Write a protein that binds this DNA or RNA. Structure first.
Lengths: 411, 96, 99, 422, 108, 84, 78, 97, 90, 104
DNA sequence: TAGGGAGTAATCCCCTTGGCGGTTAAAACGCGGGGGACAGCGCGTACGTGCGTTTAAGCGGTGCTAGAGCTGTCTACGA
DNA sequence: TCGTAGACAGCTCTAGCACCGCTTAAACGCACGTACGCGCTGTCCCCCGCGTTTTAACCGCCAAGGGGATTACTCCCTA
């Protein structure tokens, strides 16, 4: 049969705006050598069973479950490639164009590697398991997480349907989703941002916040510097995490995690990893089993997973052995814990201040001994942090500690 | 050497019996009313002192006390107190 | 059983019961010890009237009653059951002892 | 959207990955994984954007159960699976914000395209000798932004408010339910209000409460007593010309259209319109025709009456007009006088409604949805005996030693040692 | 001189004239005071206290308790318009409260 | 006779609770408690101060209820019955 | 003429109040409490003004009225 | 075509008018209302208008303190839409009721 | 009359480089009359209270510490006693 | 020759003492009482004049205005604590920038 | 400038300040635990805001009657 | 209880209302844009209540005592 009718400029849409490649043809098969990846694709005389003539191009349906979305073909390619087909393939390229209705009433049908959302015998997608990243179900909205390959153009990210909750059915291929392996297990840790109690399980390169309603992943991109903070009475040990990047909820983000742990969160933690494996993996900071708390051995694990040291909390005691006092800021009473490279707040919200941003501190001097002094900070980025209602025996020590950090003073 | 303690108790005690003979009493209520009347006496007398200074007047008529009542407390019952007091003033100022 | 009621309906009955009543709730001995304490914290040489003590308990529990009405009427606009000090902060604020 | 395969991508936006909005086809072309699908505007809820720097994020909600069906049923096919939302991303080197903001006026003109369309019959004018033709009348709802003036002309099955512009507002007799006539008996307006049965299309909108007043007010910004003679004489001559208009339309309506007289004997200053003005009964209605709008109620479709908030120092309390029609929504009249409570109560006894009060309140539309579960079945569930009280599960009071102590104070026998003064 | 007759009866009252006149001389309120004016004061205070004790005895009869308790006095001062507004800042020894009840606090 | 201490902290939870139930409060987090200990107390210290200002003026070591009366009327915190 | 106070003057007062989103029933509420404070001071000042045997009203009536209610102004005499 | 976004204008008006001492409602409808309420008991009330401006400033400042307390009620609600319920709440906690 | 002569003289003593408005002087004589009559009335009260006929600095000091306790009051008492002692020296 | 000279006071002991003669607060006048009174008046006078000079130099002006005095009220809350409901002609308030009303 | 006012002297006397041996009763701990307290959807309905004009304010000027300020002479009621 | 503090009769002054006129600005308003209050939903959560102990508040009675209520001279202050 015919050797080639070569294309070097036509798209194969591979999970978003995936640009042109190299569509050579061979005497039994069809060769795609992409202009970005270079992977060699061969669809032979036994694989090609259909090519959808939708907008046009050879949207080739093999019986692989795979949809080889060759695209960039004019209407004149409807026959001159079919003349390529006319020896052995002899393909009836269907005209449709199945769903221009703009109308959503149709059926979700689990394909084995694909998924159809049919609108009157003419579906809208058969986007494969290879071209989805993750898939969870819901009630009544199945969450399809299409994590795009970093395209600066229009990039589809999340899709969900009205799927009735597997009514006399089941999540077939939805259960056949990708695996994002748990090592260490931190269940029912009490978190303040968000308010409640959730779960944590540690994966080799990231983690998963597990729980009921708002429960997500923790990449090691998020962890950037370990923040270990005590309590002012030491009955607790706060643990606040610079979630940078912030994970999201569906409306807003999670910029900083506050974990309220008592002093009595005490348990030995089983890192389920060998001692020869952590010297590879953790650079000599954990072995397998060190006893401790849900704070102490946790923060050992966290320092290992960030592979980064601690911005030391404020060990400067203000007054009467407390780390600091609760104070009014952003209409929230919370603990202003100093840091090695800034400050941290609790519990509304996780306001992390840097020392290398502060232009100066400045004062709003109140009157009454029942917390009227106010301690604002103007940073060089313009981010002002105006802390209200501070005492006297504590603010005078805060003054000395600020001058120890040489944060300048305006009045 | 006598030094007798002084209050105003038997008056309102008898008027209590004038309108409620059956109703008993507490000295608790007696302290209530004595504290009350010394309070209100002080209030209206000090306001009369104020306004006599304000009118630049060495004297205080019951014009002064009438407006001190009506200013200091409203009410048709206050007007009835004005009526009763005006009655007793026209009584004793007629030497009756 | 021991039959647990609605946790507060019996306390509602107690609220209705004691708001009918007019008596004290602070016992005399630690109160008087507080009086001697704080008075000598100002200044020594304390010969006391117990009448002054009882008038003080009246005045302080009346101030308590002012705090109670401020608390519960903010709790009207709190639309909540558990109590916040913010209520009392606004109580002193609109009261004007500190603002 | 499109019912034609020949309704193609007019530009294939797969060649740009460019989002596109198409109001003329009442659709929107969106690159759904290289499939620039058109989408009906009646299949989409809304859209919003979140900035993070360059790679922003767009949520796009669609009409679905939980969004348009509920999880109303103008698309009643929920078990056919829909789409709920999708989410785009775009960096910044865009036009996506520009096509984003278009959806607003797209849905504006699209629901404008979804117009509601009560056009009355063209009235047969009868310019005869017995034609009650009454000048100087002020319509509200006004046609222009100013107070429109005109002239009312009565006929055999309608009125003709010939405007100053000449726009003949025809007021059919089979349209009016409640004709109202507030006099100027001390009033600032004397109205010919005609509460209709139809929301009729005139001016700009569809109206049922249409009133025709003449303001004769006194104090404005611009001993002899002859201007008051002028005021009394002009009020009386205008009002007696209006009574002539009454007795002449009663020569045309033949006493069939009730000019319902204000029962100002049972008058009060209530507020179901939440503006306390003169509220007084009429034939089958309380009315507030001294202002805008006039109050129109039907006493006839009232099952019973619950008074609300009848409690100490509540001078301004409410009342549930429990209708026979619970699809007819219930108004709560603010500022009901405690003094005017009992006369309206015995007037409800004249409406064959035994006077039943109460203090408690709830969501009343919830109770409307509760009683339409079963009308007589809710009546089995206590019914409106629920409005008062019907047993409980508790004790009572049960006190203890609530009595005066014997050792309690009683300064009776004080002292006899008393004297006068010097 | 004659017998020191009761000028209280010359006002038809209980209260002493020269005693309150001594009180106004003691309080240094002015150089002088018109003669019927402290008598006017005493009569006004007598009427006021009379209204008070009348309504207090009414509320005590509502309690059916002859011996006066301060809760008689408490519901007396609470259950008024005019002097209730006038006498706000005053509390009562062993007074009591207004036992307020909220049905919105009551479950359904 | 005794070190001046630990009596405001000697005030018990359910006494405060009884006060708040005739106060009519329905359910309370304790953190209010110590708050109240300071505020009423200081006001009390205030009037004790005022009483000190009377009693040092009164040339006595005796403390009467009279100074309480002068304070409470100068407070605005008026009380009858205990008029001395 | 309680509507002699313009709703924009009320918005001026309310951004001088620093208060943002304002219901329509706020305005007449404020007008009522305005009239209350107003009429109390007016009642008392007029009462002494009648007692002061004069017609033309000075600011000493204002001094005495604001004095008695404790709403006292500095700047004018006392 | 610009349409100014609200709130920052309100911030500027807080910084300007809470600082300033000047009258918001104009003087003549105010004075007309003053004599209007003055007539309710007595005729012939000539007014030294300095007293009228004094009571104007006093009542307006009372209103401003009431606005403060009402905004305290609003932030206690954690809301921004104002209710006269909150205003009477501010009255009674102020001690008017 | 007014103390405005004396207030202006004390002004041009302690801050001679300071102009003044008439409303500022009105403020000055306003709290002069106010706090003067406050102290005068409270000292009259305390003259009535402990059966006293004439008034000295003890009762005024006591009325101050009733009205304003604190350290401003302490230096007020110090200045008052040293001015009384200066008057006492002749 | 006046008693302000013997007491070293700026304020007229003659005028205050004559107003105490027109006072009749008590029976007689102990002559050290108006001396002590005018001394405390001079004390608080120099106090508020120093406060006014400080508020004028913090606003870079010379004429004493009640806006500076209102800044002394609203900012030195001892004065507003002693003068709660006592108000000031042409004072204003603080444009009190609260925490929630700011962005972020 | 004299006669009333506050202080030192003597004698006695009431309250409570301390405190133990008893009494009984208010309160904290252990633990279930559930009815109440607080953070996302969601939306639509009340609130903030550009252009036209629509009318209110009051100053540029002057008249004016009358309540109020100042002066001379005078009489009766609380101290 | 005497004598002077307002009272009464005049003598003279200036201030907000009345009047004519026109420009400049506060404000209704109307549709457009907007944003968060309340209900629903879900997710907790900390004192209420029951058992139990347990340790403190308070009367009888003792035991005196001490600063204050009471009355007498004696030197001192002011309009």
């Amino acid at each position: 049969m015919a050797e080639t009718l070569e294309f070097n400029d036509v798209y194969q849409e591979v999970k978003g705006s995936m640009n042109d490649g190299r569509l050579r043809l061979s005497r039994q098969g069809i060769i795609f050598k992409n202009s970005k990846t270079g992977k060699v694709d061969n669809i032979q005389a036994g694989e090609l069973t259909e090519g959808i003539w939708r907008r046009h191009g050879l949207k080739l349906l093999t019986k692989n479950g795979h949809v080889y979305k060759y695209d960039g073909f004019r209407e004149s390619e409807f026959e001159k490639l079919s003349d390529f087909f006319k020896t052995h393939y002899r393909l009836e390229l269907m005209e449709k164009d199945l769903c221009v209705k703009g109308w959503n009433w149709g059926t979700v049908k689990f394909g084995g590697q694909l998924l159809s959302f049919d609108i009157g015998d003419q579906p809208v997608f058969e986007i494969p398991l290879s071209n989805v990243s993750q898939c969870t179900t819901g009630k009544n909205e199945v969450t399809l997480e299409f994590h795009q390959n970093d395209d600066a153009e229009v990039s589809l990210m999340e899709v969900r349907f009205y799927v009735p909750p597997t009514q006399x059915x089941x999540x077939x291929x939805x259960x056949x989703x990708x695996x994002x392996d748990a090592i260490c297990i931190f269940r029912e840790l009490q978190c303040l941002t968000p308010r409640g109690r959730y779960d944590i399980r540690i994966y080799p390169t990231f983690l998963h916040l597990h729980g009921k309603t708002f429960d997500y992943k923790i990449p090691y991109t998020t962890v950037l510097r370990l923040f270990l903070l005590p309590h002012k009475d030491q009955r607790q040990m706060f643990f606040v995490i610079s979630l940078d990047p912030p994970i999201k909820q569906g409306q807003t983000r999670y910029h900083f995690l506050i974990l309220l742990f008592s002093k009595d969160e005490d348990i030995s933690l089983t890192l389920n990893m060998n001692e020869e494996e952590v010297e590879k993996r953790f650079e000599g900071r954990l072995t397998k089993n060190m006893s401790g708390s849900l704070y102490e051995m946790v923060s050992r694990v966290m320092k290992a997973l960030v592979n980064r040291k601690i911005t030391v909390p404020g060990n400067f005691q203000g007054h009467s052995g407390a780390q600091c006092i609760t104070c009014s800021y952003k209409a929230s009473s919370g603990l202003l814990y100093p840091l090695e490279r800034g400050f941290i707040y609790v519990h509304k919200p996780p306001v992390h201040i840097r020392f290398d941003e502060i232009s100066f501190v400045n004062f709003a001097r109140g009157t009454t001994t029942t917390r009227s002094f106010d301690f604002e900070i103007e940073t060089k980025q313009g981010t002002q942090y105006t802390f209200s209602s501070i005492e006297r025996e504590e603010y005078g020590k805060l003054f000395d500690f600020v001058n120890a950090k040489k944060l300048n003073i305006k009045n | 050497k006598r030094s007798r303690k002084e209050s105003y108790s038997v008056y309102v005690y008898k008027v209590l019996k004038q309108v409620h003979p059956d109703t008993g009493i507490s000295s608790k209520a007696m302290g209530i009313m004595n504290s009350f009347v010394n309070d209100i006496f002080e209030r209206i007398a000090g306001e009369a002192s104020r306004l006599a200074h304000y009118n630049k007047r060495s004297t205080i008529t019951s014009r002064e006390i009438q407006t001190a009542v009506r200013l200091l407390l409203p009410g048709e019952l206050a007007k009835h107190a004005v009526s009763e007091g005006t009655k007793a003033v026209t009584k004793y100022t007629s030497s009756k | 059983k021991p039959h647990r009621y609605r946790p507060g309906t019996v306390a509602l009955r107690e609220i209705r019961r004691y708001q009918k009543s007019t008596e004290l709730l602070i016992r005399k001995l630690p109160f008087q010890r507080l009086v001697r304490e704080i008075a000598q914290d100002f200044k020594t040489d304390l010969r006391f009237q117990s009448s002054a003590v009882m008038a003080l308990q009246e005045a302080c529990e009346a101030y308590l009653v002012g705090l109670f009405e401020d608390t519960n009427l903010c709790a009207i606009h709190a639309k909540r059951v558990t109590i916040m000090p913010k209520d009392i902060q606004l109580a002193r604020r609109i009261r004007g002892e500190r603002a | 959207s499109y019912k034609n395969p020949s309704l193609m991508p007019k530009e294939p936006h797969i060649r740009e990955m460019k989002i596109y909005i198409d109001k003329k086809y009442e659709t929107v072309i969106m690159p759904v994984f290289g499939i620039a699908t058109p989408f009906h505007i009646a299949t989409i809820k809304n859209i919003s954007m979140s900035v993070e720097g360059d790679y922003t994020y767009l949520r796009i909600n669609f009409y679905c159960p939980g969004s348009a069906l509920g999880r109303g049923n103008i698309f009643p096919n929920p078990e056919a699976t829909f789409v709920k939302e999708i989410t785009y991303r775009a960096s910044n080197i865009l036009n996506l914000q520009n096509a984003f903001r278009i959806i607003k006026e797209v849905q504006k003109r699209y629901k404008x395209x979804x117009x509601x369309x009560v056009k009355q019959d063209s009235l047969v004018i009868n310019l005869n000798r017995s034609n009650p033709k009454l000048k100087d009348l002020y319509i509200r709802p006004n046609i222009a932004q100013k107070r429109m003036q005109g002239s009312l002309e009565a006929h055999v099955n309608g009125f003709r408010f010939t405007s100053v512009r000449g726009d003949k507002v025809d007021i059919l007799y089979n349209n009016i339910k409640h004709a109202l006539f507030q006099p100027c008996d001390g009033e600032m307006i004397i109205v010919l209000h005609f509460h209709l049965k139809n929301a009729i299309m005139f001016g700009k909108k569809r109206h049922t409460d249409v009133q025709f007043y003449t303001e004769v007010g006194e104090i404005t910004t611009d001993d002899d007593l002859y201007a008051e003679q002028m005021e009394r004489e002009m009020r009386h001559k205008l009002k007696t010309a209006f009574k002539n208009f009454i007795e002449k339309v009663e020569a045309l309506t033949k006493e069939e259209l009730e000019f319902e007289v204000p029962f100002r004997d049972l008058g009060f200053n209530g507020a179901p319109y939440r503006s306390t003005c003169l509220l007084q009964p009429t034939s089958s209605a309380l009315v507030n025709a001294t202002e805008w709008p006039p109050f129109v109620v039907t006493l006839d479709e009232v099952e019973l009456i619950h008074f609300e908030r009848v409690q100490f120092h509540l001078k301004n309390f409410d009342m549930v007009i429990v209708y026979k029609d619970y699809s007819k929504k219930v108004t709560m009249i603010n500022a009901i006088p405690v003094a005017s409570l009992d006369p309206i109560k015995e007037w409800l006894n004249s409406c064959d409604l035994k006077y039943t009060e109460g203090v408690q309140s709830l969501n009343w539309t919830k109770i409307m949805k509760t009683i339409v579960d079963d009308p007589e079945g809710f009546f089995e569930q206590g019914g409106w005996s629920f409005l008062x009280x019907x047993x409980x599960x508790x004790x009572x009071x049960x006190x203890x030693x609530x009595x005066x102590x014997x050792x309690x104070x009683x300064x009776x026998x004080x002292x006899x040692x008393x004297x006068x003064x010097x | 001189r004659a017998k020191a007759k009761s000028r209280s009866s010359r006002a038809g009252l209980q209260f002493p004239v020269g005693r309150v006149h001594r009180l106004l001389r003691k309080g240094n309120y002015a150089e002088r005071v018109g003669a019927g004016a402290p008598v006017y004061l005493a009569a006004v205070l007598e009427y006021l206290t009379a209204e008070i004790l009348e309504l207090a005895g009414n509320a005590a009869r509502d309690n059916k308790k002859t011996r006066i308790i301060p809760r008689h006095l408490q519901l007396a001062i609470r259950n008024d318009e005019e002097l209730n507004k006038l006498l706000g800042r005053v509390t009562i020894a062993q007074g009591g409260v207004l036992p307020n009840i909220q049905a919105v606090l009551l479950p359904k | 006779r005794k070190v001046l201490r630990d009596n405001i902290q000697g005030i018990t939870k359910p006494a405060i609770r009884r006060l708040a139930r005739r106060g009519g409060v329905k359910r309370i987090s304790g953190l209010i408690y110590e708050e109240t200990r300071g505020v009423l107390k200081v006001f009390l210290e205030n009037v004790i101060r005022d009483a000190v200002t009377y009693t040092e003026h009164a040339k006595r070591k005796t403390v009467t209820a009279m100074d309480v009366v002068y304070a409470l009327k100068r407070q605005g915190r008026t009380l009858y019955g205990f008029g001395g």
